[PDB]
Amino acid sequence: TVTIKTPDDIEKMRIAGRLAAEVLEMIGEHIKPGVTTEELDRICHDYIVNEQKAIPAPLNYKGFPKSICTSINHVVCHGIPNEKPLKEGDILNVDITVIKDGYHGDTSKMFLVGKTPEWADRLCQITQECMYKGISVVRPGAHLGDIGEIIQKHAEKNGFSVVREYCGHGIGKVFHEEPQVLHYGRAGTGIELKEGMIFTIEPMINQGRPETRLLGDGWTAITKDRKLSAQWEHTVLVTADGYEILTLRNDETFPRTSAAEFELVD
Amino acid sequence: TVTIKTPDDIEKMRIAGRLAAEVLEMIGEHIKPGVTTEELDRICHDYIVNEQKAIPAPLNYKGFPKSICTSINHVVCHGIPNEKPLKEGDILNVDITVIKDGYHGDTSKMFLVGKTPEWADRLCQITQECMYKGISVVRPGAHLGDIGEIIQKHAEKNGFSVVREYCGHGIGKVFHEEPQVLHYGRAGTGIELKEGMIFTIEPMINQGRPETRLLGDGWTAITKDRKLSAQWEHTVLVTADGYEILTLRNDETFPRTSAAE
Amino acid sequence: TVTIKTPDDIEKMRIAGRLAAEVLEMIGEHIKPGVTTEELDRICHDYIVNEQKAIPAPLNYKGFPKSICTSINHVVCHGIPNEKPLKEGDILNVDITVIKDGYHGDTSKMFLVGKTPEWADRLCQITQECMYKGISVVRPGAHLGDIGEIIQKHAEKNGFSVVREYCGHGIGKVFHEEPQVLHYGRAGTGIELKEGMIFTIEPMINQGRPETRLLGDGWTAITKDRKLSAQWEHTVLVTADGYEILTLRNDETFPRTSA
Amino acid sequence: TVTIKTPDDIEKMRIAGRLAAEVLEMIGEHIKPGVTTEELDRICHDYIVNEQKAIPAPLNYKGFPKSICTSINHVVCHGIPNEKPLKEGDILNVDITVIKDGYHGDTSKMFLVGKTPEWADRLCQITQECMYKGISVVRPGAHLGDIGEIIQKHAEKNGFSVVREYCGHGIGKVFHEEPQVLHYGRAGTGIELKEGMIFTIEPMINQGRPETRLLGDGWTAITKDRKLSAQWEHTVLVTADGYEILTLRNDETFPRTSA
Ligand code: MET
Ligand code: MET
Ligand code: MET
Ligand code: MET
Ligand SMILES: [Mn+2]
Ligand SMILES: [Mn+2]
Ligand SMILES: [Mn+2]
Numbered sequence A: 001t002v003t004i005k006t007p008d009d010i011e012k013m014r015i016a017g018r019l020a021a022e023v024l025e026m027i028g029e030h031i032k033p034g035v036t037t038e039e040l041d042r043i044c045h046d047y048i049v050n051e052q053k054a055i056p057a058p059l060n061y062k063g064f065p066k067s068i069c070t071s072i073n074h075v076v077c078h079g080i081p082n083e084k085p086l087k088e089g090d091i092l093n094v095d096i097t098v099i100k101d102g103y104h105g106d107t108s109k110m111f112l113v114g115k116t117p118e119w120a121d122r123l124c125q126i127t128q129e130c131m132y133k134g135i136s137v138v139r140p141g142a143h144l145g146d147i148g149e150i151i152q153k154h155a156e157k158n159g160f161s162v163v164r165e166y167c168g169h170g171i172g173k174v175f176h177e178e179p180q181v182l183h184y185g186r187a188g189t190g191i192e193l194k195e196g197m198i199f200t201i202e203p204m205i206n207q208g209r210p211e212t213r214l215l216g217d218g219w220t221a222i223t224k225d226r227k228l229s230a231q232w233e234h235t236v237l238v239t240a241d242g243y244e245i246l247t248l249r250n251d252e253t254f255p256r257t258s259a260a261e262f263e264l265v266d
Numbered sequence B: 001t002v003t004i005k006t007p008d009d010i011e012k013m014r015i016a017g018r019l020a021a022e023v024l025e026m027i028g029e030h031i032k033p034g035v036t037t038e039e040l041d042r043i044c045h046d047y048i049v050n051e052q053k054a055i056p057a058p059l060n061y062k063g064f065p066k067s068i069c070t071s072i073n074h075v076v077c078h079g080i081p082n083e084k085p086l087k088e089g090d091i092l093n094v095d096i097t098v099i100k101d102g103y104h105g106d107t108s109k110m111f112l113v114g115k116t117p118e119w120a121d122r123l124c125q126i127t128q129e130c131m132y133k134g135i136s137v138v139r140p141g142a143h144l145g146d147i148g149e150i151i152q153k154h155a156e157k158n159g160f161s162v163v164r165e166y167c168g169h170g171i172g173k174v175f176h177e178e179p180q181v182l183h184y185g186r187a188g189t190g191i192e193l194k195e196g197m198i199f200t201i202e203p204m205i206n207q208g209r210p211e212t213r214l215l216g217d218g219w220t221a222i223t224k225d226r227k228l229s230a231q232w233e234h235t236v237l238v239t240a241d242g243y244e245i246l247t248l249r250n251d252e253t254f255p256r257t258s259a260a261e
Numbered sequence C, D: 001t002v003t004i005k006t007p008d009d010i011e012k013m014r015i016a017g018r019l020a021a022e023v024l025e026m027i028g029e030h031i032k033p034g035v036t037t038e039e040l041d042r043i044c045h046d047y048i049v050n051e052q053k054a055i056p057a058p059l060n061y062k063g064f065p066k067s068i069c070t071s072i073n074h075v076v077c078h079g080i081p082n083e084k085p086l087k088e089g090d091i092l093n094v095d096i097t098v099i100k101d102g103y104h105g106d107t108s109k110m111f112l113v114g115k116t117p118e119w120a121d122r123l124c125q126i127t128q129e130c131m132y133k134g135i136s137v138v139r140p141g142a143h144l145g146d147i148g149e150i151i152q153k154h155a156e157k158n159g160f161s162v163v164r165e166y167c168g169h170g171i172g173k174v175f176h177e178e179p180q181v182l183h184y185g186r187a188g189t190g191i192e193l194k195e196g197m198i199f200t201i202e203p204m205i206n207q208g209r210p211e212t213r214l215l216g217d218g219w220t221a222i223t224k225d226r227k228l229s230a231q232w233e234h235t236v237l238v239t240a241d242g243y244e245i246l247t248l249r250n251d252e253t254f255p256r257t258s259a
């Protein structure tokens, strides 16, 4: 069963969600050619632990040895931070998860490292759109398939493919719980959404074919065809009216809630 | 019945050979006019070390300063990656060796950079044909000379010459071991091939005359006459009844084994 | 290190070999269109256990769920007896191994079910010849490679191909022991044969390409091109000056031994 | 380069071989104490010319003055038939070659005349075994060395030595062609055999040391140490996967072919 969070859980989830967003607003300043993913990891780790008084959820999670995941270029997800420097032209996903007093906030974004090819930029833009469209359909009475279909149609119209081997997930006082949030599928299928459900929408969208391959560290997934892949992620609450993005950043213009979306249509 | 078993060493050589082949498959998509050979070298080195969790065997080998060899046009072999960009019309050999947990896989292939002249295309095709002919005679009871004869005949019939001062070699847990695999000679001579032997066939074929000379850096060999030179290389295992190419790529149509098409 | 059977081991292997042969001699009378391979399996099972006072070696061996293997048409080896009826035109391998007081006799033969097409008959014939040829070169001083070369030359010369990833095997008080016996290769290579070695020669020979594919049950191997495949097997003793076929049937005219 | 025979050549070589063998079958009844080798020569000459409509190949061949060779006792080979009678206790090699319509068949055999010295019969039997073992390794892919090695090991195990100064040879529409077939040497070296080659295996095996001495007649070779020497010879075809003995006699029990 999918857990239904109480009003109290939801307030604590807003808090965790705001912190994870703040790690991303903070780290952007440090991202330039030459900085290593491990130095970014150390910066996020110290911010989360020393300033936010919280804990990086990935750390030691099923063996994962670092505090954040850093996925660059043809890396699809779960890249382990290391001493390899960022190179101008890279696209970088920084994926944060913060646990504040037992509650998880999970979110990621793409960064452009110095000057980047314009078509890498567009992959990143289109992928964020896919995420935003997936969020736009969330409301009580929608079905999980609604989210997959709308992401999949937008990616595919743009000549990209959706990664099927990884999905979004319920999130709460546990990092990964039901449901599996697939980023492909058919409208009206899968479980029905209810107020108080909380889950991530985190589409991985590849420039070429959808298949991935795992490296020998057990975590780093790359595109089998070595083409680019981008991801963005938010933690989403189902509200009485529709959705609330718990991990919204201050640099984002997408409406935080169905209520803010209704207002702007006036 | 029982499913066939292979010695451990042989499966670890098949892994090393498949990795070496994948580096060539990978690097093809990066080769175009304007890319420097030192840039190819960095791309290959990072893919071997960071993704394959393996080691570029050429690196610091007898002092060689790079991770791959890049040999262009009248360069015969062992060209040192550098800051010179590839130009339209270049022929380029990229020669990889990977060491995966101590086992080596050694292979090279010719790339046509942009629109190349027909005579450079013909040199590359016939050199590849020479290599595949050499591989085709490999089986228990073949003699090393069979490989040199078949290559020499195909090269010379088509107007080309064989470089004599470089040869293929045994390979396994060491990068270079006995035997010397000459790309010229006479059938039925030299040692008899035995099942489990692994060695390379890597003919260097010249547009003009066979003589080469070594430059100042002690690695870069060039044709004496300054005409083109092409090379292709595979790592080959002698099997119970024929050959198995350990470094075969997905883009190759030649059969991986004798059986076996 | 290949085990060398002692004279007593040899008497015991002869008994097991004769029993495995008599299972094929027996089951032949039951094979016709309409009979299911799970019926054949039950009949062989009851014969080995209740009559011979022996054990069907394949039963529960690495999980194999039946007492014999029944490979039809494009199936290469290890087919699992089941509810499908034999059809007119099928070729069928019944592969038997009996354990009689701890000693194994392993043998298989092809059956032509009703009227069979000429190309199926030819394949079965040439595979039998291949197996007999492989048997004929066995003597002390020969090498395992002599068996693979003679089989593969006879197959290929007649347009057929040799399955490469499955082989014959030493046999004794254990079902599968050293050496691997490839049905392809070069004469004079591999281990040297000595009196008292016992092993199988069980070539699988394909109508089209050599390659095979394992199905979902983890056992049933089929030709990759779905063309026909045939197998014949015998358990073979290296004697002082040639061979002895421990699993010879009385329907066979090839000599029991080289002398 | 060794010549390769066509199928028509081979049918003709079969005829020449069979005729050569038939001379040895015919001559047996005339071998007894008191018969001279020149009488055996004349009888074989007349049989070949008058009855087989063929020609004795040794006649006038490089000066040789007779139709057959007859080598007795310590004579190793190429004895010239003459007026000396066979004596109780002799061992005698009769070496025949017939040309039939241009094709040659070359074969010899030992005869024991009456009561022979006691280790003379075994010399002759071991020499025939040596020849048979040489034949038994012939197939495409074998090496000439394989013949040399198997013969030499059997001879030396029995305390005998192999004559090195003479050898077997290619044969066909010519009496002596490539390659030299040495009766000593090392497995897996020398010329590799191919289907359609035809050559002789004709080991000369000495009771004592291997060295020979040539007599004044330029032909008759004897053992330097004067101990007994024996020889047997057949013409051998390399077939698709083994051998065919073109000069087999009806008195022999070794198989005509590997098949
Ligand atoms: C090493 S655990 C990383 C998990 C990732 N934050 C996710 O979105 O599930
Ligand atoms: C299910 S075990 C199959 C064994 C088969 N009789 C063989 O030859 O090895
Ligand atoms: C600089 S060492 C390069 C050696 C090369 N890969 C070979 O085939 O031997
Ligand atoms: C005097 S010619 C005799 C030749 C002999 N028959 C041989 O085998 O060569
Ligand atoms: Mn990526
Ligand atoms: Mn995440
Ligand atoms: Mn997530």
Ligand SMILES: [Mn+2]
Pocket: B001, C106, C168, C169, C200, C202, C233
């Ligand atoms: Mn078996």
Ligand SMILES: [Mn+2]
Pocket: B071, B072, B073, B074, B075, B076, B091, B093, B228, B229, B230
């Ligand atoms: Mn060149």
Ligand SMILES: [Mn+2]
Pocket: B106, B168, B169, B200, B202, B233
């Ligand atoms: Mn090499």
Ligand SMILES: [Mn+2]
Pocket: B095, B096, B097, B106, B107, B108, B202, B233
């Ligand atoms: Mn190389």
Ligand SMILES: [Mn+2]
Pocket: B001, C095, C096, C097, C106, C107, C108, C202, C233
């Ligand atoms: Mn069996």
Ligand SMILES: [Mn+2]
Pocket: C071, C072, C073, C074, C075, C076, C091, C093, C228, C229, C230, C231
């Ligand atoms: Mn079959």
Ligand SMILES: [Mn+2]
Pocket: D071, D072, D073, D074, D075, D076, D077, D091, D093, D228, D229, D230
């Ligand atoms: Mn004599």
Ligand SMILES: [Mn+2]
Pocket: D106, D168, D169, D200, D202, D233
């Ligand atoms: Mn002769």
Ligand SMILES: [Mn+2]
Pocket: D095, D096, D097, D106, D107, D108, D202, D233
């Ligand atoms: Mn003769």
Ligand SMILES: [Mn+2]
Pocket: B141, B143, B192, D143, D188, D189, D190, D192
């Ligand atoms: Mn040889």
